[PDB]
């Protein structure tokens, strides 16, 4: 991961993706708030989509800043919860940036 | 634009630059976090009723125009 005092030897050079790697970690309360909001919004959309109702009202509520910042945090440090009941991860390629989370629950 | 400011220092790879009041532009450090840091941004500027017929007539005789559904 990003280790300052390696890149800053130069005032005229910075490695690809340095910003997102060396960026300030998200405050716990904002990571949890945004995660709860994004999971709720997307789960509500998935539900609507299943019934054949492409609900745009739920979609418009997605804030790309929140998700992009979560990408920065899960690439920074991936998170989990637990038979782990949560698992999230961020990926950063030069052509695309992605976030992949998974919340599982067990009945048995 | 992001291309011209990147071209001011291509070796920064779209990472923010820092302009001192002297005038020299250098590659930006994540930890200077000042306003003089070019190419960064605080927030993203993104951009993605049943009416009865009697109620309709009543709500149309008042505003004398034809189209009442804004």
């Amino acid at each position, epitope marked *: 991961q990003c280790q300052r005092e390696t890149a*800053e*030897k130069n005032d005229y050079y910075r490695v690809p993706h340095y910003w997102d790697a060396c960026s300030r970690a998200l*405050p716990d309360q904002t990571r949890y708030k945004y995660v709860e909001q994004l999971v709720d919004l997307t789960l509500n959309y998935h539900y609507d989509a299943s019934h054949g109702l492409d609900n745009f009202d739920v979609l418009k509520r997605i804030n790309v800043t929140e998700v992009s910042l979560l990408i920065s945090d899960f690439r920074r440090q991936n998170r989990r919860g637990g038979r782990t009941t949560f698992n999230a991860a961020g990926s950063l390629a030069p052509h695309a940036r992605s976030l992949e989370f998974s919340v599982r629950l067990f009945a048995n | 634009t992001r291309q011209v400011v990147h071209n001011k220092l291509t070796s920064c790879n779209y990472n923010p630059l820092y302009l001192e009041a002297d005038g020299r532009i250098r590659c930006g450090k994540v*930890n200077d976090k000042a306003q003089y840091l070019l190419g960064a941004a605080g927030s993203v500027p993104y951009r993605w009723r049943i009416v009865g017929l009697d109620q309709y007539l009543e709500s149309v005789k008042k505003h004398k125009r034809l189209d009442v559904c804004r």
Partner: antibody
Amino acid sequence: VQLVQSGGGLVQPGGSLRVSCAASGFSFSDHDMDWVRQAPGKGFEWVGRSRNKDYSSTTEYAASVRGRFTISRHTSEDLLYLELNTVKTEDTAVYFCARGPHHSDRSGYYGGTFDIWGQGTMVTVSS
Amino acid sequence: DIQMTQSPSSVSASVGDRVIITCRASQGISSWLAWYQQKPGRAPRLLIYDASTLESGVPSRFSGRGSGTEFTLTINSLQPEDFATYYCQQGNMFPLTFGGGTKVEIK
């Protein structure tokens, strides 16, 4: 604004020692608190930082002490702790607790300078 | 990790004398440098922060300049209270590194 220290003293080689400090005149939770040490006749060395109540990873140390020292806070009594477990001979020094930047200051997460120090506590390692 | 070069190593001056003290960082730190004063037997006191900001309660005679690998801190009107040790601190990245200390003594 005031800062009062406690702990310190002698400690048998490979032993443990607690230095703590209490903060008054400011909101101890709303400020990050670092520890700085002075060896007799030498320069200052940074020991670590405790974050400003908004972080889950709440401790940072210098590489030499990263594996031996623990920084903590009280659950609710507004106290700062620095426990030097298995202290070494080269850790003998006077330890001061200091206050860092406010949580609304951008610089504090990644660095900063200090502004207030406590009176200090002498930690002597000897047999 | 960041080496600190302070000059001069030891200095002597009289009351009313001008002293200028330099501190050098191994790699460039923009402005995250501070200057502290340690009276013998006392705890340190912050004198200047953000490289150039004079801390309230400190005499207004101090003024800070410099950047990158060389910074300077003047002491224009030495006052009888100005006998002490002045130290530079780097705040750009962890670990913070300090100077060897600059001893200001009366002449």
